[PDB]
Structure 1
């Protein structure tokens, strides 16, 4: 790892704390970082720190490296988790990101279902969706394809800002090998545009498909996509025209928007720009 001046953070100025989560990928812990906020070199900030586990593979390391590199290349946006820094020298790779106090969106929505712990309003659901469409519209404009959009990969801040996170599978638009049989082999099937597998390509419009599944997760308050259907049967069902059903208490219009995202023809799906404008309208006219 060639030393990156702008991004390197002093190992001695970081204090690791309570664990946040553990996957096949690695582990994330809470931590205090003194001075990561220049110009407040006095002040210690709660952060999240992503790193490898003891059983990590070569691929694990290079995936953590790529996730970090990707986060450096996309600018600041309100609806994307910010990279804060990295310890890359003389020790294990630590990737320091901004801390979100309310966890991932799936858990967040589940914990605040109706009792049959601040219940979600319809407006709140529309607002979440709108925020996420704005984040994706930004990402698309930066030539980034995320490829792993899901409620579990969204973070919720203290003030309920939605933060697209987990850039572990994300790529520059030009950094996918079209038509090779191994391309898109590691994308979660239930969130994946059909063309990602059938055609072995990935465009912003493939992210749109994923966005649709995310919307469905939002409106079911964190439900599981295609319930009762196994992943090995899904594509056969999708070619035949199966689509998930309307969530209770979701409007007809928001459901048509989901369905549009699940158009078999990529170019017939809305753009993120169109999703933003539509959701902006629905949110505002709800308010009034």
Structure 2
């Protein structure tokens, strides 16, 4: 009963719904097979991520998903974001079809690839060598910055940029997810802990947390936290600090320490992102360039 948009509309019968991937505040995401997403190859199979309303959804849940859908249409296509592939709005439940990232989110990607502990018996010629190396970590940070730069150019604010909201493809390409979402910024439970133990308040810029102000520079703050996540290989920010203590510490201008095995260049970028005045933080364009210099200097 929603209006037909032939540009994006995809026949729902060309989808085979598979195993659920996860669920958000509004909507659930399910893995699925798509046939003929490329109209030039009608019988070609591809793996996609389908977002849909949960069971017994409210009208506001529908409005939020519709709102997300329209943002996806306007945002355009970029290598480092989750792109819209199609929609199903006609004669059936609302489907928002987007790209699927085979390796899950960036946080779990890093945590599952932490170096072998010294408790492990030396077996082979590279026993100390873990899956993750410094240039690849830098590349991950660079890709997120480029993706955010694109989103910024499209006047899009993420409001919850983090490792958990960055997805990893089969080719280890970073793709920013859930960027055009209504997140109820006027009613945030700052003490709320997710089912996986995450405290989303630890990613909020001071002007966002204290003054409910969101800009692209507030995302830059979040990017700084995301930088810390990457080079702690999926660690949780402000270790062992409860939300109540986080409040007072932030008011005192407290910042996270430099993590182990992290070069001063990158902790330098982190601290720049965490400058109190938003105009004293780098832009994403500057972050891209700065991370590019480091990346090129370690890609001989």
TM superposition score normalised by structure 1: 0.91
Give me the whole-angstrom Cα distance separating, in 2, the residues matched to 1:60 and 1:210. 26
Equivalent runs, 1:137-216 vs 2, <5 Å: 137-169=149-181, 183=186, 185=188, 188-216=200-228
Aligned residue pair count:
279
Distance 1:168 1:138, change over 3 A: closer
Work out whether residues 18 and 30 of structure 1, in 8 Å CA contact, stay in contact via their aligned partners in 2.
yes
Q: Whole-Å Cα distance in 2 between the matches of residues 162 and 254 of structure 1?
A: 18
The separation in 2 between residues aligned to 1:16 and 1:207, in whole angstroms, is 34
Q: Which residue of structure 1 aligns with residue 245 of structure 2?
A: 233
Structure 1: runs of 5 or more not aligned: 177-181
Bigger-Rg structure (1/2): 2
What SS does structure 1 have at the residue aligned with 2:297?
helix
TM-superposed deviation, 1:169:
2.6
Alignment-derived partner of residue 106 in structure 1: 107
Q: How far 1:55 moved relative to its partner?
A: 4.3
Q: Is the aligned partner of 1:83 residue 2:101?
A: no
Deviates more, 1:230-239 or 1:205-214: 230-239
Residue 26 of structure 1: how far off its partner (Å):
2.8
Q: What secondary structure does 2:298 align onto?
A: helix
TM-score, normalisation: structure 2: 0.87
Seen in structure 2, the aligned counterparts of structure 1 residues 149 and 156 have a Cα distance that, compared at 3 Å, is same
Q: Give me the whole-angstrom Cα distance separating, in 1, the residues matched to 2:3 and 2:257.
A: 50
- Greater shift, 184-193 or 43-52, is seen at 184-193
Give 1:186 shift: 7.2
- Closer, same or farther in 2 for the Cα pair 1:20/1:287, shift >3 Å? same
Of the structure 1 ranges 34-43 and 10-19, higher mean CA displacement relative to structure 2 is found in 34-43
Q: Which residue of 2 aligns with 1:220?
A: 232
**1:47 aligned partner:** 48
Q: Deviations over 1:98-149 (max 9, x none)?
A: 1111111111001100121962101111000001111111111111111111
Q: Please identify runs of 4+ aligned residues in structure 1 that moved more than 6 A.
A: none
Gaps of 5+ in 2: 118-128, 191-199
Distance verdict in 2 for CA 1:206–1:147, change over 3 Å? same
Q: Provide the secondary structure at the position in 2 that maps to 1:215.
A: helix
Alpha-carbon separation, structure 1, partners of 2:105 and 2:186: 27
Q: Distance in 2 between matches of 1:192 and 1:42?
A: 45
Computed over aligned residues only, the root mean square deviation of the Cα atoms, in angstroms, reads 2.0
Distance 2:187 2:173 in 1: 30
